[PDB]
Protein backbone atom coordinates (compact mmCIF):
# COMPACT_ATOMS: atom_id res chain seq x y z
CA UNK A 1 0.00 0.00 0.00
CA UNK A 2 1.05 3.62 -0.47
CA UNK A 3 1.70 6.11 2.33
CA UNK A 4 2.99 9.69 2.14
CA UNK A 5 5.63 11.38 4.27
CA UNK A 6 5.46 15.17 4.34
CA UNK A 7 8.63 17.12 5.05
CA UNK A 8 8.80 20.54 6.70
CA UNK A 9 10.15 22.04 3.46
CA UNK A 10 7.24 21.19 1.13
CA UNK A 11 8.22 17.85 -0.40
CA UNK A 12 5.91 14.86 -0.04
CA UNK A 13 7.69 11.47 -0.18
CA UNK A 14 5.68 8.50 -1.48
CA UNK A 15 6.51 5.07 -0.05
CA UNK A 16 5.35 1.54 -0.78
CA UNK A 17 4.82 -0.27 2.52
CA UNK A 18 2.90 -3.12 4.13
CA UNK A 19 0.78 -2.76 7.30
CA UNK A 20 3.22 -5.15 9.00
CA UNK A 21 6.21 -2.86 8.39
CA UNK A 22 7.96 -1.47 11.41
CA UNK A 23 8.68 2.21 11.89
CA UNK A 24 12.37 1.40 11.43
CA UNK A 25 11.56 -0.24 8.09
CA UNK A 26 9.76 2.94 7.06
CA UNK A 27 12.72 5.09 8.13
CA UNK A 28 14.99 2.85 6.07
CA UNK A 29 12.74 3.37 3.05
CA UNK A 30 13.01 7.13 3.58
CA UNK A 31 16.80 6.70 3.65
CA UNK A 32 16.59 4.88 0.31
CA UNK A 33 14.68 7.76 -1.25
CA UNK A 34 16.26 10.77 0.42
CA UNK A 35 19.51 9.66 2.10
CA UNK A 36 18.40 10.73 5.60
CA UNK A 37 19.90 8.49 8.32
CA UNK A 38 17.16 6.64 10.21
CA UNK A 39 18.63 7.63 13.61
CA UNK A 40 17.94 11.35 12.78
CA UNK A 41 14.32 10.76 11.65
CA UNK A 42 11.33 11.58 13.84
CA UNK A 43 8.08 10.37 12.31
CA UNK A 44 4.73 11.77 13.46
CA UNK A 45 1.18 10.63 12.82
CA UNK A 46 -1.90 12.20 14.40
CA UNK A 47 0.29 14.28 16.69
CA UNK A 48 2.09 11.23 18.10
CA UNK A 49 5.76 10.38 17.72
CA UNK A 50 5.98 6.93 16.08
CA UNK A 51 8.28 4.51 17.92
CA UNK A 52 10.72 2.08 16.34
CA UNK A 53 9.56 -1.50 16.99
CA UNK A 54 5.88 -0.61 16.54
CA UNK A 55 4.23 -1.30 13.19
CA UNK A 56 2.10 0.85 10.91
CA UNK A 57 -0.87 -1.33 11.87
CA UNK A 58 -0.10 -0.71 15.55
CA UNK A 59 -0.83 2.98 14.96
CA UNK A 60 -3.76 2.15 12.68
CA UNK A 61 -1.90 3.73 9.76
CA UNK A 62 -3.94 2.79 6.70
CA UNK A 63 -3.44 3.16 2.96
CA UNK A 64 -2.91 6.77 1.76
CA UNK A 65 -2.10 7.98 5.25
CA UNK A 66 0.15 11.03 5.62
CA UNK A 67 3.00 11.03 8.13
CA UNK A 68 5.22 13.99 8.99
CA UNK A 69 9.02 13.96 9.21
CA UNK A 70 11.20 16.07 11.51
CA UNK A 71 14.97 15.84 11.85
CA UNK A 72 16.35 15.23 15.39
CA UNK A 73 18.47 18.40 15.60
CA UNK A 74 18.35 20.05 19.03
CA UNK A 75 18.78 23.77 19.62
CA UNK B 1 35.46 52.68 15.56
CA UNK B 2 34.75 49.06 16.72
CA UNK B 3 31.75 50.48 18.68
CA UNK B 4 30.50 52.63 15.78
CA UNK B 5 30.95 49.82 13.18
CA UNK B 6 29.21 47.05 15.20
CA UNK B 7 25.79 47.37 13.51
CA UNK B 8 27.29 47.93 10.02
CA UNK B 9 29.57 44.85 10.38
CA UNK B 10 26.81 42.34 11.14
CA UNK B 11 24.49 44.03 8.64
CA UNK B 12 27.06 43.77 5.84
CA UNK B 13 27.55 40.04 6.49
CA UNK B 14 23.81 39.34 6.56
CA UNK B 15 23.30 41.28 3.33
CA UNK B 16 25.58 38.69 1.67
CA UNK B 17 24.05 35.61 3.32
CA UNK B 18 20.48 36.82 2.70
CA UNK B 19 21.10 38.28 -0.78
CA UNK B 20 18.44 35.92 -2.19
CA UNK B 21 15.77 36.93 0.34
CA UNK B 22 13.68 38.91 -2.14
CA UNK B 23 10.96 39.79 0.37
CA UNK B 24 13.65 40.82 2.87
CA UNK B 25 11.89 39.99 6.14
CA UNK B 26 14.30 37.23 7.19
CA UNK B 27 17.25 39.49 6.36
CA UNK B 28 15.82 42.16 8.68
CA UNK B 29 14.97 39.64 11.39
CA UNK B 30 18.51 38.24 11.50
CA UNK B 31 19.89 41.76 11.91
CA UNK B 32 17.42 42.94 14.57
CA UNK B 33 17.68 39.87 16.80
CA UNK B 34 21.36 40.45 17.59
CA UNK B 35 20.34 43.11 20.12
CA UNK B 36 18.48 40.44 22.12
CA UNK B 37 19.61 37.85 24.65
CA UNK B 38 16.80 35.57 23.43
CA UNK B 39 13.61 35.66 21.36
CA UNK B 40 10.28 33.86 21.22
CA UNK B 41 10.29 34.00 17.39
CA UNK B 42 11.36 30.51 16.29
CA UNK B 43 12.11 29.48 12.70
CA UNK B 44 11.64 25.74 13.13
CA UNK B 45 8.13 25.61 11.65
CA UNK B 46 7.16 23.22 14.49
CA UNK B 47 4.41 23.95 17.06
CA UNK B 48 5.63 23.18 20.60
CA UNK B 49 4.26 30.78 23.60
CA UNK B 50 6.69 30.60 20.64
CA UNK B 51 5.89 32.67 17.49
CA UNK B 52 5.93 29.98 14.80
CA UNK B 53 5.42 30.20 11.03
CA UNK B 54 5.02 26.87 9.25
CA UNK B 55 6.43 28.36 6.05
CA UNK B 56 9.80 29.22 7.65
CA UNK B 57 11.50 25.89 6.76
CA UNK B 58 10.68 26.09 3.05
CA UNK B 59 11.54 29.77 2.78
CA UNK B 60 14.89 29.33 4.49
CA UNK B 61 15.71 26.37 2.23
CA UNK B 62 15.00 28.62 -0.77
CA UNK B 63 17.02 31.57 0.57
CA UNK B 64 20.12 29.47 1.27
CA UNK B 65 19.97 27.11 -1.74
CA UNK B 66 22.06 29.22 -4.11
CA UNK B 67 24.96 29.63 -1.69
CA UNK B 68 26.00 25.96 -2.25
CA UNK B 69 27.93 24.42 -5.13
CA UNK B 70 25.32 21.65 -5.46
CA UNK B 71 21.73 21.82 -4.13
CA UNK B 72 21.70 20.30 -0.64
CA UNK B 73 19.61 17.30 0.30
CA UNK B 74 17.12 17.31 3.19
CA UNK B 75 19.75 16.17 5.67
CA UNK B 76 22.97 18.00 6.46
CA UNK B 77 26.14 16.65 4.85
CA UNK B 78 29.84 17.35 5.29
CA UNK B 79 29.85 17.13 1.50
CA UNK B 80 27.55 20.25 1.28
CA UNK B 81 30.04 22.94 0.15
CA UNK B 82 29.52 26.69 -0.03
CA UNK B 83 30.59 28.29 -3.29
CA UNK B 84 34.10 29.69 -3.21
CA UNK B 85 32.58 32.93 -4.49
CA UNK B 86 30.31 33.25 -1.47
CA UNK B 87 33.24 32.55 0.87
CA UNK B 88 35.07 35.41 -0.85
CA UNK B 89 32.01 37.62 -0.45
CA UNK B 90 31.63 37.05 3.28
CA UNK B 91 35.38 37.69 3.74
CA UNK B 92 35.14 40.88 1.63
CA UNK B 93 32.24 42.00 3.84
CA UNK B 94 34.82 42.20 6.65
CA UNK B 95 37.76 43.53 4.62
CA UNK B 96 39.58 40.18 4.76
CA UNK B 97 39.72 39.37 1.03
CA UNK B 98 43.54 39.47 1.05
CA UNK B 99 44.23 38.95 4.75
CA UNK B 100 46.38 36.05 5.86
CA UNK B 101 44.86 32.55 5.71
CA UNK B 102 45.11 32.23 9.49
CA UNK B 103 42.94 35.35 9.84
CA UNK B 104 40.47 34.27 7.16
CA UNK B 105 40.10 30.82 8.72
CA UNK B 106 39.49 32.38 12.14
CA UNK B 107 36.81 34.61 10.61
CA UNK B 108 35.03 31.60 9.07
CA UNK B 109 35.06 29.80 12.43
CA UNK B 110 33.52 32.89 14.02
CA UNK B 111 30.77 33.09 11.37
CA UNK B 112 30.13 29.37 11.90
CA UNK B 113 29.76 30.03 15.63
CA UNK B 114 27.36 32.87 14.85
CA UNK B 115 25.10 30.46 12.93
CA UNK B 116 25.29 27.93 15.74
CA UNK B 117 23.93 30.70 17.97
CA UNK B 118 21.23 31.67 15.49
CA UNK B 119 20.16 28.01 15.32
CA UNK B 120 20.17 27.53 19.12
CA UNK B 121 17.42 27.37 21.81
CA UNK B 122 17.82 31.06 22.83
CA UNK B 123 17.40 32.45 19.29
CA UNK B 124 15.60 30.77 16.30
CA UNK B 125 15.69 27.20 17.67
CA UNK B 126 14.17 25.48 20.75
CA UNK B 127 15.47 22.91 23.23
CA UNK B 128 14.42 20.09 20.91
CA UNK B 129 14.33 21.61 17.40
CA UNK B 130 16.69 23.74 15.36
CA UNK B 131 16.43 25.24 11.81
CA UNK B 132 18.47 22.96 9.57
CA UNK B 133 19.57 25.58 7.05
CA UNK B 134 21.26 27.59 9.79
CA UNK B 135 23.09 24.49 10.97
CA UNK B 136 23.94 23.51 7.39
CA UNK B 137 25.56 26.89 6.80
CA UNK B 138 27.65 26.60 9.98
CA UNK B 139 28.62 23.03 9.03
CA UNK B 140 29.75 23.99 5.52
CA UNK B 141 31.78 26.91 6.81
CA UNK B 142 33.63 24.45 9.05
CA UNK B 143 34.69 22.50 5.94
CA UNK B 144 36.46 25.66 4.80
CA UNK B 145 38.09 26.05 8.21
CA UNK B 146 39.32 22.46 8.00
CA UNK B 147 40.81 23.00 4.50
CA UNK B 148 42.59 26.27 5.54
CA UNK B 149 43.56 24.87 8.96
CA UNK B 150 43.62 27.06 12.13
CA UNK B 151 46.16 26.87 14.97
CA UNK B 152 44.45 25.66 18.17
CA UNK B 153 41.74 23.72 16.32
CA UNK B 154 42.38 20.12 15.19
CA UNK B 155 40.70 18.30 12.28
CA UNK B 156 39.09 15.94 14.87
CA UNK B 157 37.52 18.98 16.65
CA UNK B 158 36.22 20.30 13.30
CA UNK B 159 34.67 16.92 12.53
CA UNK B 160 33.20 16.75 16.03
CA UNK B 161 31.57 20.16 15.52
CA UNK B 162 30.26 19.08 12.12
CA UNK B 163 28.92 15.79 13.49
CA UNK B 164 26.97 17.69 16.15
CA UNK B 165 25.59 20.17 13.63
CA UNK B 166 24.54 17.47 11.16
CA UNK B 167 22.95 15.21 13.75
CA UNK B 168 25.29 12.24 13.44
CA UNK B 169 24.54 9.19 15.54
CA UNK B 170 26.23 9.45 18.93
CA UNK B 171 26.76 13.23 18.67
CA UNK B 172 25.30 15.73 21.18
CA UNK B 173 23.34 17.86 18.72
CA UNK B 174 22.45 20.85 20.95
CA UNK B 175 23.69 24.02 19.23
CA UNK B 176 23.43 26.23 22.34
CA UNK B 177 26.20 24.13 23.87
CA UNK B 178 28.08 23.90 20.58
CA UNK B 179 28.07 27.69 20.31
CA UNK B 180 29.50 27.97 23.84
CA UNK B 181 32.19 25.41 22.96
CA UNK B 182 33.26 27.12 19.75
CA UNK B 183 33.06 30.52 21.49
CA UNK B 184 35.47 29.31 24.23
CA UNK B 185 37.79 28.08 21.44
CA UNK B 186 37.67 31.44 19.64
CA UNK B 187 38.41 33.21 22.94
CA UNK B 188 41.38 30.97 23.71
CA UNK B 189 42.70 31.55 20.20
CA UNK B 190 42.50 35.36 20.42
CA UNK B 191 43.79 35.62 24.05
CA UNK B 192 47.30 36.69 22.87
CA UNK B 193 46.44 37.80 19.29
CA UNK B 194 44.98 41.34 18.93
CA UNK B 195 44.44 40.80 15.17
CA UNK B 196 42.20 37.76 15.87
CA UNK B 197 40.51 39.68 18.76
CA UNK B 198 39.68 42.45 16.25
CA UNK B 199 38.12 39.93 13.85
CA UNK B 200 36.13 38.36 16.68
CA UNK B 201 34.73 41.76 17.69
CA UNK B 202 33.79 42.53 14.08
CA UNK B 203 31.79 39.29 13.73
CA UNK B 204 30.26 38.28 17.04
CA UNK B 205 27.43 40.61 18.16
CA UNK B 206 28.15 42.40 21.44
CA UNK B 207 25.18 40.88 23.26
CA UNK B 208 26.38 37.35 22.34
CA UNK B 209 30.09 37.82 23.42
Automatic annotation (TrEMBL), chain B:
Source organism superkingdom: Bacteria
Descriptive protein name: Uncharacterized protein
Organism this protein belongs to: Verrucomicrobiota bacterium
Taxon lineage: Bacteria, Pseudomonadati, Verrucomicrobiota
